[PDB]
Design a binder for this molecule. Structure first.
Ligand SMILES: OC[C@H]1O[C@H](O)[C@H](O)[C@@H](O)[C@@H]1O
Ligand SMILES: [Ca+2]
Length: 559
């Protein structure tokens, strides 16, 4: 059985508007630059776009600190430009998903300005205010973005809670007036015909009664602890009943911190919470849990075991998104592939094949369709991201970690790796801007750009385009069940996707040498659906493949 829906079979593209296309020379991407490139996305074969936050914001965290939920960000343009994006997407039969950030607002949001003015203001209980303990913060809560999660306010003498930047105070979801105002805000956007919502850090809305201290253990994985609020599902379901279920939308929940065996409660269709799981297990598989900027070695067997556990967790009643990178993570070809010149294009096509053959809604992050890479940051000042400055302050300026070792890691792990501007063409600043880009463009744009790829049939771009057409053509590549042929193999990633008699095999050689790979049991090849970097022909009934380094392919198997 399988309830098909548009959002299960969609291929989404994620646009980070600050870095997509600048159309007025200020160095920052804008709405009009999205509009201008919709035919490019339609040619790739995308039918839905998720945009990162597009609201009025002081940009401490690039739109995730929202100062007014009902205004367009000044740098992105006007409400008129927003409504044109919708209307021009509609002309092209594309659906828009927006980013809903209601764990916290900017400290400049009118609600916070009132709340901080004193204990008597009607907005006081819109945020979390607590007394110090012996002239220190109410408790030992750390922030994701550095220091304590409590900021002293001199006006009142009390501390306010901020899991993120001190300019992102957390909204008090235990206050029913807060939830009702957020619901009116959602209806403002949903009434404009938006087709999807992504809920940013949806699992942290419910705070822990009485705010007790975290134990030593809990301090080393506090992200998980902040997901343990006792009313989180009451609140998500109430939001579904009062708002989400009255419109026709797909909702995605970004559940950072949630242990994978707690994820299903958010997405089981019978629970009437959200539709699509954004889990972080796979994309953070190689990240230290205590020093969250540090990476550690990982293996293909580790990777594929997580793919399979995420897949099984969704089970019959949930549904996964699948992504290998996004605006919070290094670029996939650098992170999971080999980004050197001899291999980058083969590895990028290998990972596209993986992505576009998962039992999940795939999300392609802008630039990945070109094989864009991490950026060669050298000095701490080459980064923009508030998060990396928080890590530098906590670990390097306290003398706990040498600056150079810190940099060797954040070069690989920083969010700013995925925020360098999109490489449109080979002209100055890769045609992203007529001015000076807000974050420097990778010098590899001369070799990696959309103009060089869009009409080259062998390009990474056109291999993504071919895979998307393949996936739409073959229902088993969307709905088929997933079986990993060998979860312990560290060289060749091979799995099947099966619907009844229709059985397909995906095979990717993660090694930089030729690998021979004999199929298990009685499996043999009926057809080749596509391959990249193939040298040995595959004939009817072949039971073995000779895989070139970085070779990837999809095959139909004999019954
Ligand atoms: O969902 C988690 C979100 O948390 C914060 O508000 C981040 O800065 C953002 O990039 C991330 O996606
Ligand atoms: Ca601009």
């Amino acid at each position: 059985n399988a309830l098909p829906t548009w959002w299960k079979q969609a291929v989404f593209y994620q646009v980070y508007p600050r870095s997509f296309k600048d159309t007025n020379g200020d160095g920052i991407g804008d709405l009009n630059g999205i509009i201008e490139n919709l035919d490019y996305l339609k040619k790739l074969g995308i039918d839905a776009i998720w945009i990162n936050p597009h609201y009025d914001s002081p940009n401490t965290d690039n739109g995730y600190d929202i100062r007014d939920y009902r205004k367009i960000m000044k740098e992105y343009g006007t409400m008129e430009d927003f409504d044109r994006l919708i209307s021009e997407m509609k002309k092209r039969n594309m659906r828009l998903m927006i980013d809903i950030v209601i764990n916290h607002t900017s400290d400049q949001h009118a609600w916070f300005v009132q709340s901080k003015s004193g204990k008597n203001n009607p907005y006081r209980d819109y945020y979390f205010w607590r007394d110090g303990k012996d002239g220190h913060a109410p408790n030992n809560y750390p922030s994701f973005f550095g220091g304590s999660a409590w900021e002293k306010d001199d006006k009142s003498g009390q501390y306010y809670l901020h899991y993120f930047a001190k300019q992102q105070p957390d909204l008090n979801w235990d206050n029913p007036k807060v939830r009702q105002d957020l619901y009116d805000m959602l209806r403002f956007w949903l009434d404009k015909g938006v087709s999807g919502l992504r809920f940013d850090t949806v699992a942290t809305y419910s705070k822990i009664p009485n705010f007790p201290d975290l134990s030593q253990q809990q301090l080393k994985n506090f992200a998980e602890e902040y997901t343990k609020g006792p009313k989180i599902h009451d609140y998500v379901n109430e939001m579904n009943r009062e708002v989400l279920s009255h419109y026709d939308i797909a909702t995605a929940g970004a559940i950072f911190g949630v242990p994978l065996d707690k994820s299903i409660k958010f997405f089981d269709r019978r629970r009437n919470e959200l539709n699509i799981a954004f889990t972080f297990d796979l994309i953070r598989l190689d990240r230290d849990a205590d020093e969250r900027w540090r990476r550690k070695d990982w293996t293909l067997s580790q990777f594929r075991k997580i793919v399979d556990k995420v897949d099984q967790t969704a089970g019959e009643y949930g549904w996964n998104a699948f992504f290998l990178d996004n605006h919070d993570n290094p670029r996939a070809v650098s992170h999971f592939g080999d980004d050197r010149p001899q291999w980058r294009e083969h590895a990028a096509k290998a990972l596209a094949t993986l992505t576009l053959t998962q039992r999940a809604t795939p999300f392609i992050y802008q630039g990945s369709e070109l094989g864009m890479t991490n950026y060669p940051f050298k000095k701490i000042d080459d980064f923009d991201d508030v998060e990396v400055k928080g890590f530098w302050q906590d670990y390097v300026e306290t003398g706990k970690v040498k600056a150079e070792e810190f940099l060797q890691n954040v070069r690989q792990t920083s969010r700013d790796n995925s925020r360098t501007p999109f490489q449109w063409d080979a002209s100055k600043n890769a045609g992203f801007t007529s001015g000076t880009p807000w974050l420097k463009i990778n010098p590899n744009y001369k070799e990696i750009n959309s103009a060089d790829q869009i009409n080259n049939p062998n390009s990474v771009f056109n291999y993504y385009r071919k895979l998307i057409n393949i996936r739409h053509d073959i229902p088993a590549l969307t709905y088929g069940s997933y079986i990993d042929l060998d979860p312990d193999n560290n060289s060749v990633y091979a799995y099947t996707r099966t619907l009844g008699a229709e059985k397909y095999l995906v095979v990717i050689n993660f090694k930089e040498e030729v690998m021979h790979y004999t199929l298990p049991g009685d499996l043999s090849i009926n057809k080749v659906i596509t391959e990249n970097n193939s040298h040995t022909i595959v004939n009817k009934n072949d039971r073995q493949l000779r895989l070139e380094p970085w070779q990837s392919g999809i095959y139909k198997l004999n019954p």
